[PDB]
Design a protein around this ligand. Sequence first.
Ligand SMILES: *[C@@H]1O[C@H](CO[C@H]2O[C@@H](C)[C@@H](O)[C@@H](O)[C@@H]2O)[C@@H](O[C@@H]2O[C@H](CO)[C@@H](O[C@@H]3O[C@H](CO[C@H]4O[C@H](CO)[C@@H](O)[C@H](O)[C@@H]4O)[C@@H](O)[C@H](O[C@H]4O[C@H](CO)[C@@H](O)[C@H](O)[C@@H]4O)[C@@H]3O)[C@H](O)[C@H]2NC(C)=O)[C@H](O[C@@H]2O[C@@H](C)[C@@H](O)[C@@H](O)[C@@H]2O)[C@H]1NC(C)=O
Ligand SMILES: *[C@@H]1O[C@H](CO[C@H]2O[C@@H](C)[C@@H](O)[C@@H](O)[C@@H]2O)[C@@H](O[C@@H]2O[C@H](CO)[C@@H](O[C@@H]3O[C@H](CO[C@H]4O[C@H](CO)[C@@H](O)[C@H](O)[C@@H]4O)[C@@H](O)[C@H](O[C@H]4O[C@H](CO)[C@@H](O)[C@H](O)[C@@H]4O)[C@@H]3O)[C@H](O)[C@H]2NC(C)=O)[C@H](O[C@@H]2O[C@@H](C)[C@@H](O)[C@@H](O)[C@@H]2O)[C@H]1NC(C)=O
Ligand SMILES: *[C@@H]1O[C@H](CO)[C@@H](O[C@@H]2O[C@H](CO)[C@@H](O[C@@H]3O[C@H](CO)[C@@H](O)[C@H](O[C@H]4O[C@H](CO)[C@@H](O)[C@H](O)[C@@H]4O)[C@@H]3O)[C@H](O)[C@H]2NC(C)=O)[C@H](O)[C@H]1NC(C)=O
Ligand SMILES: *[C@@H]1O[C@H](CO[C@H]2O[C@@H](C)[C@@H](O)[C@@H](O)[C@@H]2O)[C@@H](O[C@@H]2O[C@H](CO)[C@@H](O)[C@H](O)[C@H]2NC(C)=O)[C@H](O[C@@H]2O[C@@H](C)[C@@H](O)[C@@H](O)[C@@H]2O)[C@H]1NC(C)=O
Ligand SMILES: *[C@@H]1O[C@H](CO)[C@@H](O[C@@H]2O[C@H](CO)[C@@H](O)[C@H](O)[C@H]2NC(C)=O)[C@H](O)[C@H]1NC(C)=O
Ligand SMILES: *[C@@H]1O[C@H](CO)[C@@H](O[C@@H]2O[C@H](CO)[C@@H](O)[C@H](O)[C@H]2NC(C)=O)[C@H](O)[C@H]1NC(C)=O
Ligand SMILES: *[C@@H]1O[C@H](CO)[C@@H](O[C@@H]2O[C@H](CO)[C@@H](O)[C@H](O)[C@H]2NC(C)=O)[C@H](O)[C@H]1NC(C)=O
Ligand SMILES: *[C@@H]1O[C@H](CO)[C@@H](O)[C@H](O)[C@H]1NC(C)=O
Ligand SMILES: *[C@@H]1O[C@H](CO)[C@@H](O)[C@H](O)[C@H]1NC(C)=O
Ligand SMILES: *[C@@H]1O[C@H](CO)[C@@H](O)[C@H](O)[C@H]1NC(C)=O
Ligand SMILES: *[C@@H]1O[C@H](CO)[C@@H](O)[C@H](O)[C@H]1NC(C)=O
Ligand SMILES: *[C@@H]1O[C@H](CO)[C@@H](O)[C@H](O)[C@H]1NC(C)=O
Ligand SMILES: *[C@H]1O[C@H](CO)[C@@H](O)[C@H](O)[C@H]1NC(C)=O
Ligand SMILES: *[C@H]1O[C@H](CO)[C@@H](O)[C@H](O)[C@H]1NC(C)=O
Ligand SMILES: *[C@H]1O[C@H](CO)[C@@H](O)[C@H](O)[C@H]1NC(C)=O
Lengths: 494, 494, 497
Amino acid sequence: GDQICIGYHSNNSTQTVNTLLESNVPVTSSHSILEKEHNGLLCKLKGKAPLDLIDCSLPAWLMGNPKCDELLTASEWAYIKEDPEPENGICFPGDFDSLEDLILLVSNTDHFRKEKIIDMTRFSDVTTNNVDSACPYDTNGASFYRNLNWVQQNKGKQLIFHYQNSENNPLLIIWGVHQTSNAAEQNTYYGSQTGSTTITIGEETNTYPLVISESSILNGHSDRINYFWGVVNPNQNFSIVSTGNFIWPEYGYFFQKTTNISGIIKSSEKISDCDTICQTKIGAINSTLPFQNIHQNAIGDCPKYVKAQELVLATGLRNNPIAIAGFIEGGWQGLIDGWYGYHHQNSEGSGYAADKEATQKAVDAITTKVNNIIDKMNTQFESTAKEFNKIEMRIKHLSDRVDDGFLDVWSYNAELLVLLENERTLDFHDANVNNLYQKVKVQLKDNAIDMGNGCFKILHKCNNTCMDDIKNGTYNYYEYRKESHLEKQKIDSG
Amino acid sequence: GDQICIGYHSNNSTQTVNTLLESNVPVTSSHSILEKEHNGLLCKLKGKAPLDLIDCSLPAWLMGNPKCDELLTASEWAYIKEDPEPENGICFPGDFDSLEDLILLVSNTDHFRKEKIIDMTRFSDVTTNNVDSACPYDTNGASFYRNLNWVQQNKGKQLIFHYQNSENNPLLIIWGVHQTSNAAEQNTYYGSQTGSTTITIGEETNTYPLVISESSILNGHSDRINYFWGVVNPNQNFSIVSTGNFIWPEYGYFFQKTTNISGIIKSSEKISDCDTICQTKIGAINSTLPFQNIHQNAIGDCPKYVKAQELVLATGLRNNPIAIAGFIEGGWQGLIDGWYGYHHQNSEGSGYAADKEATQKAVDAITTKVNNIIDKMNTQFESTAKEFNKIEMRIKHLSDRVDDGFLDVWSYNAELLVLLENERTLDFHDANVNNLYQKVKVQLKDNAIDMGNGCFKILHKCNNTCMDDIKNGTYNYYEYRKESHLEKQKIDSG
Amino acid sequence: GDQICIGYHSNNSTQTVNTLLESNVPVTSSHSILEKEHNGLLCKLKGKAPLDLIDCSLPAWLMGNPKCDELLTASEWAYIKEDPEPENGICFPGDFDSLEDLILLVSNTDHFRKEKIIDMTRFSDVTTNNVDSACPYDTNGASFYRNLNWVQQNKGKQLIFHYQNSENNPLLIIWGVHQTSNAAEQNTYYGSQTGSTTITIGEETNTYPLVISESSILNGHSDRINYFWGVVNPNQNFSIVSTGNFIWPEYGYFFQKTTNISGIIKSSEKISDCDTICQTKIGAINSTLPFQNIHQNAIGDCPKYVKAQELVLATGLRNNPIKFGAIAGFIEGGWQGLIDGWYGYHHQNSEGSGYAADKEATQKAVDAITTKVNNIIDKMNTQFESTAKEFNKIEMRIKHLSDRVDDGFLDVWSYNAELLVLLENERTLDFHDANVNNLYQKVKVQLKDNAIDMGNGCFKILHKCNNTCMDDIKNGTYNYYEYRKESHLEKQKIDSG
Ligand SMILES: *[C@@H]1O[C@H](CO[C@H]2O[C@@H](C)[C@@H](O)[C@@H](O)[C@@H]2O)[C@@H](O[C@@H]2O[C@H](CO)[C@@H](O[C@@H]3O[C@H](CO[C@H]4O[C@H](CO)[C@@H](O)[C@H](O)[C@@H]4O)[C@@H](O)[C@H](O[C@H]4O[C@H](CO)[C@@H](O)[C@H](O)[C@@H]4O)[C@@H]3O)[C@H](O)[C@H]2NC(C)=O)[C@H](O[C@@H]2O[C@@H](C)[C@@H](O)[C@@H](O)[C@@H]2O)[C@H]1NC(C)=O
Ligand SMILES: *[C@@H]1O[C@H](CO[C@H]2O[C@@H](C)[C@@H](O)[C@@H](O)[C@@H]2O)[C@@H](O[C@@H]2O[C@H](CO)[C@@H](O[C@@H]3O[C@H](CO[C@H]4O[C@H](CO)[C@@H](O)[C@H](O)[C@@H]4O)[C@@H](O)[C@H](O[C@H]4O[C@H](CO)[C@@H](O)[C@H](O)[C@@H]4O)[C@@H]3O)[C@H](O)[C@H]2NC(C)=O)[C@H](O[C@@H]2O[C@@H](C)[C@@H](O)[C@@H](O)[C@@H]2O)[C@H]1NC(C)=O
Ligand SMILES: *[C@@H]1O[C@H](CO)[C@@H](O[C@@H]2O[C@H](CO)[C@@H](O[C@@H]3O[C@H](CO)[C@@H](O)[C@H](O[C@H]4O[C@H](CO)[C@@H](O)[C@H](O)[C@@H]4O)[C@@H]3O)[C@H](O)[C@H]2NC(C)=O)[C@H](O)[C@H]1NC(C)=O
Ligand SMILES: *[C@@H]1O[C@H](CO[C@H]2O[C@@H](C)[C@@H](O)[C@@H](O)[C@@H]2O)[C@@H](O[C@@H]2O[C@H](CO)[C@@H](O)[C@H](O)[C@H]2NC(C)=O)[C@H](O[C@@H]2O[C@@H](C)[C@@H](O)[C@@H](O)[C@@H]2O)[C@H]1NC(C)=O
Ligand SMILES: *[C@@H]1O[C@H](CO)[C@@H](O[C@@H]2O[C@H](CO)[C@@H](O)[C@H](O)[C@H]2NC(C)=O)[C@H](O)[C@H]1NC(C)=O
Ligand SMILES: *[C@@H]1O[C@H](CO)[C@@H](O[C@@H]2O[C@H](CO)[C@@H](O)[C@H](O)[C@H]2NC(C)=O)[C@H](O)[C@H]1NC(C)=O
Ligand SMILES: *[C@@H]1O[C@H](CO)[C@@H](O[C@@H]2O[C@H](CO)[C@@H](O)[C@H](O)[C@H]2NC(C)=O)[C@H](O)[C@H]1NC(C)=O
Ligand SMILES: *[C@@H]1O[C@H](CO)[C@@H](O)[C@H](O)[C@H]1NC(C)=O
Ligand SMILES: *[C@@H]1O[C@H](CO)[C@@H](O)[C@H](O)[C@H]1NC(C)=O
Ligand SMILES: *[C@@H]1O[C@H](CO)[C@@H](O)[C@H](O)[C@H]1NC(C)=O
Ligand SMILES: *[C@@H]1O[C@H](CO)[C@@H](O)[C@H](O)[C@H]1NC(C)=O
Ligand SMILES: *[C@@H]1O[C@H](CO)[C@@H](O)[C@H](O)[C@H]1NC(C)=O
Ligand SMILES: *[C@H]1O[C@H](CO)[C@@H](O)[C@H](O)[C@H]1NC(C)=O
Ligand SMILES: *[C@H]1O[C@H](CO)[C@@H](O)[C@H](O)[C@H]1NC(C)=O
Ligand SMILES: *[C@H]1O[C@H](CO)[C@@H](O)[C@H](O)[C@H]1NC(C)=O
């Protein structure tokens, strides 16, 4: 008896997937949508180099700690890379005001250029470019921040200065305010019990009255110099009126703001010669997969952070391999050139044949599904600027629970997406196999006995042309009716 | 030979949809769930008018800048509409404290009424209602904020005032503190080198010591008047003790808070004669669709912001139109009065007929699906109050990434929702058509030949009563068995 | 004529569910994924007891208001339970600085121990342990915070103190700064118009200059004592230099930080003898269900807050039962008579009739639905939930940011949970239909033309089919050829009759 069977592809794969309904289902192929790779690399971001602060803190670098390299040429950077514990920080003790807000402005810049803003020689009856042993060039020297000019010996005299930004870029300036320890120290340094400074930027007034007060000794100092900064926009002016206790913004930085705030990547590692679309402090996430379980904080074009161990989409078929029987009893290791197909038996021989059209149709559909799940993750620029000052822990906690909130959303949704889609993909394969089965069944009608195992017992001699017609949907029922009827009669007696 | 076919509706639609499996699939009908219309209108919000500040800033209007229209009668508003750069702002230079917090309180109010709080005539040996050329009615005048009474010539004398809020609404009061330029100016205005004010609201004490300091000249002023505000709750008291340098809250506003914070809409446009459930600064989003791609910031009962270009749900069938064949080969342009139905062929004639019951059932199901996807988007009141002071850029950044976070959540989920639901809607239609096919098939049994094209070749004369019985599920197989068997015999040999 | 039918379970259930396509569909069984119970209970959190402040505020308890119970032994707590309006708060009027940040540190602690930090007798020519009628032990008395030592009569003299934390846990210290009303009061208390204090913790300097200023009368006081706090880490030092107007941190608390910030639960209720994985101020949420509509704010291992009134997953079948007498199959509805499974058979032959469940198909579907329900629940594996969402009174804009963050997540979870249920219910019902149809097809392909498909889910068998024959069909071992002849002959009678 000639036979034609419907069946599907099996293989040697050990891969499994989970669905909403079933766990650890063996499948012929699958595809991960979760980026998990740790490489520990620090790279350029979208072809743009980071600023390597070496062993200096950002304030130390900005203010020009003598132990920190000077910015000689116009530069740019995608993010800032800083050591977790810089050797060279603020050398003369004092607070650096609003560092977090400053980071927002300079984390990603397109032009960045140091320029002399003030001719310090224009002031009379004072000393300039003063130095201190707390800020040495190297072992035992005495120097100071390059950009910040410590003026002394005011003797209560008022210095007046005005500046106009006639360039096309905003100007970043940083200055210092000297808090002396006692009246004696105040006299030694300035020769008067006065020393207040008002610095005005645009319409904004900043006034620093003389403060004399003892503090604990840090780096050989019971006194402090507190640091502040401001931005002078194109065509804006700034002015200074000082009677003492002031560290002048002799040098400043012209810079061009960017739209995408990155932040500071804190790492001991050095910058490698590599490029990534997404960067973290423990490595690059150089991947367009929609999810990652590598790190909560990152910068650039990044997958969503989730806590999943894996997210594997089924793509292939249930891997349940079995005259040969058909799809009802399992898959065919022997069907090697497609997903769904046929096996035939007649006088001329036997063999497997793939349904190329049905296979390709399903391939396009599953590929479209996976690509949709991946490509629809079109994200906002990811930032790592998530710091607040030390008296703002409540805000940092809000920042933390915001990220916890999104973490729980993406984790749950990604996890359920995978389980649901895997269930459907497997049903989709079954529906496709059943369709080939039905297409054969309705062609043969009562010219065949449905064996119930995915195969048909044909009630007439069916040569290779006949087999091809069934597989091609061009089988003529009437052409074989008579022969089929005669064979059926014999069956109806035996 | 009599025939009955199962088929479905095609039409002239050019609409396409995307599914998880396929792209740009032609369908007979579809429905957008994404609001995209730009109208540029500023409207009432749920029948409630906004406050139009004209060309004044909110502080200028509240304090009663002479160039700003006075609130003459009690009012209310759903939101505040302010020019992006108001012509009339703070006339006497100084800072307005905590504007952002104030906006939370007065952006959406149910009552707002000005009332005189202090009889300024009760104070002796001072001058009141002082004016200044920086706050003119117009060119060359000298006037002042209507609500704020500038007291001078204290000569260090202590003024004492107490007030009890015996109304049921909170009372908003705004005051000013004069920072003079130098001792001489302090003398000219107050006749004493003293001038401190303590203002107490409920259990809260605010002390404003005398500050004398030069600032840069703004509008002819090197001195400053800085503005502060407070809220005196129902049955709370406030009191003032002042020796000078004080601008008194002669007038204040009783106001009724609402639960739903809206905010300030910044636009040059005027308030039009329209009404919307959701408003943005570039136009109304007067729509109950679950998503919108119009603007990140909005107020009211609003769809979620997404970055999608379109979100179109399939509602109708694949629009793939094809003696006539049935559903296997495509849809019927000839089936005009339903989604699924039949075509029959007999001696009495031929024609199309819709399955009304199957069509209505599917219509109800799809209507339910679309309405669920829309109506389940039942949202919290949307606010545009997302401002922080200029020294809080880190918090504004937190606010920005929060919205970036939700934008990415809603965009990805809406996009995938549409793709998944479109796939299922198309399969739903296939399943319904297949059901009608099976229902005909199992009635006819071997009284007909399944032609494999969605049509049946009936082996007996099947009149309109017979055709109706098949479509109605009341066909009697046994009634036509004998006649059918005879035709089959001719077939099993012929 | 012998018959075999394929059908499914019905019962007396009145439960309904909603799907994307249909509303209020009666089903034989279902399962809620929404925790809705209000119990008003305050419990231990994961076996860890809360700190009950009784009728005291957290600052009053920390500083040792005499009317508040003293911490006598080392302790621990999962969260802090405070009355909404404590009777005993700050007795000497003044502001308590940065309470919100402090809460982040002490809301959940593993060791917490009061210890004397400063020997106050080391200071000469001053008075210590000063008291005030605003902080009494009882009626008409005068006392003071136990932990805070009010030093007076400095007479401008500088006191100096240095301390090193030589223990293994951080040290919380709390101090006070006296703002006097006027020069006369300043003189009465300190005998000098000076009184500034500098307190240094590690490298962090805090200076509190003398402020003399009148305020309104609160609890009989026009003056103020303002409170501040700091944390001295293991091996860190702190120091104090004061010339007056200072209330000293004589006692402090050693404590061990935890990773999971809980917060303050505000309630009038007392602590019950119960245990919960998630707690709110209106009751325990002792449930691993993925969603809850009980309260926006909670602590612990908690379901996500949603605004849904209900989220009921279908588990069982459409409960649409069919109206001796011929019985139809699945096409016309379910079987009240099928009691031992979800899907199964009904047969009729010469030996009798009866219902029988398909055990294998029932078990397979039960495992599948159980897996589905458990996935929807167990994948909700959440970050520790916190209720610390407070900011100072001059920070309403940040509180508003916090509020809209929560509104934002509320809208996400509500919409997604609601649609998850509608989608999954639609699919669960289709899943049952597909399983029933599979049994139908398996019988059909076995019988072939040895039977007439009646179209109601039943087959009229064209030969005598006894109990062995019926068992074979149900077991998939029916032999078509064994009955072909008899079936064909019976078909002949039909093709003429
Ligand atoms: C940024 O700062 C600059 C520099 O000015 C400051 O310089 C500091 C060093 C400090 O001393 C500070 O006090 C200075 O203001 C601002 O530009 C200045 O603006 C002022 C007006 O505010 C101009 O003053 C004018 O000076 C004219 C005389 O000198 C000019 O012309 C001379 C030839 O005769 C020439 O030799 C000289 O070098 C100058 O070029 C004088 O004629 C003017 O008198 C008229 O003033 C008004 C006219 O309407 C009227 O009231 C009066 O009766 C007279 O008719 C006037 O006093 C300065 O010239 C000008 N300095 C420079 C170098 O340009 C700048 O102000 C902004 O730009 C200017 C050009 C104006 O448009 C301003 O309105 C504008 O705000 C500051 N920029 C900002 C953003 O604040
Ligand atoms: C808001 O302020 C009002 C107004 O009073 C303030 O007025 C300012 C101008 C300023 O000077 C401020 O210091 C004032 O307190 C508060 O109401 C006042 O409350 C005080 C007590 O806090 C009452 O004082 C009493 O006065 C009684 C005499 O007045 C009554 O009789 C007269 C009839 O002609 C007339 O003078 C007046 O209209 C009253 O009808 C006097 O008998 C009392 O003596 C005994 O009282 C207590 C024992 O209870 C004891 O301390 C005292 O030694 C005596 O034994 C007492 O001195 C004021 O009468 C009262 N003023 C008015 C007009 O009501 C208000 O306080 C709040 O309301 C009152 C009614 C009380 O319940 C308070 O407990 C409560 O806090 C302030 N509101 C708030 C929330 O603070
Ligand atoms: C799925 O897995 C099975 C293996 O588990 C695999 O079938 C195996 O294929 C290999 C060859 O790829 C066969 O290996 C042979 O084993 C015989 C003994 O049984 C050896 O004698 C053979 O050795 C000769 O040939 C080798 C090269 O073919 C030479 O390297 C060697 O020197 C000898 O000349 C040979 O190794 C193995 O027998 C089969 N096993 C079975 C049961 O078929 C199957 O191919 C996998 N499926 C796919 C698609 O990969
Ligand atoms: C932290 O405090 C310790 C303890 O010493 C201190 O004790 C109190 C009671 C008071 O008398 C202080 O004046 C006294 O310093 C310091 O340890 C001391 O170090 C200094 C030298 O810097 C020395 O004078 C003491 O003898 C040391 N005492 C001992 C035996 O610990 C800390 O000093 C720092 O830490 C030490 C480990 C040591 O390496 C020292 O060099 C270092 O500076 C104090 N820390 C600071 C910076 O204040
Ligand atoms: C700043 O970051 C954004 C990330 O949103 C970048 O915008 C994306 O750019 C590419 C093409 O320019 C697209 O794939 C995305 O659709 C864009 N997203 C959006 C929201 O427009 C942007 O290019 C970045 N800017 C720079 C200079 O890197
Ligand atoms: C404040 O805004 C909220 C939006 O959340 C409005 O509440 C909705 O209003 C109607 C009935 O008032 C309901 O259909 C929605 O379900 C409500 N949502 C909630 C959470 O209650 C509310 O109407 C607004 N308040 C006013 C008076 O305008
Ligand atoms: C702090 O809270 C977290 C909440 O995530 C707890 O971490 C969970 O621990 C339990 C078992 O203790 C696991 O079932 C979860 O998988 C953990 N969640 C995650 C995402 O880590 C943690 O145990 C808590 N710590 C303490 C001391 O109770
Ligand atoms: C990141 O991806 C790009 C594009 O695939 C590739 O050229 C580059 O080598 C990748 N970098 C790393 C770290 O592999
Ligand atoms: C807003 O919608 C309502 C109800 O659909 C409608 O009546 C009204 O015309 C709309 N307003 C605008 C701005 O068109
Ligand atoms: C139509 O169908 C119903 C049920 O299938 C049947 O009861 C009714 O008699 C039919 N209508 C006619 C006119 O026969
Ligand atoms: C349901 O229906 C009737 C109502 O009383 C009852 O007699 C019958 O036993 C019930 N069925 C079951 C399963 O209990
Ligand atoms: C909380 O759940 C646990 C575990 O199921 C149980 O032992 C305990 O009784 C529950 N507590 C409450 C509040 O009922
Ligand atoms: C195979 O069968 C067909 C159908 O009858 C016949 O026409 C044809 O000759 C046969 N082909 C060959 C090559 O034997
Ligand atoms: C059509 O044919 C059927 C079957 O013979 C018969 O019962 C019925 O009367 C006929 N209908 C009409 C309209 O005559
Ligand atoms: C029932 O019928 C079968 C079918 O031939 C027969 O073999 C068997 O003996 C009968 N069963 C019994 C035990 O009566």
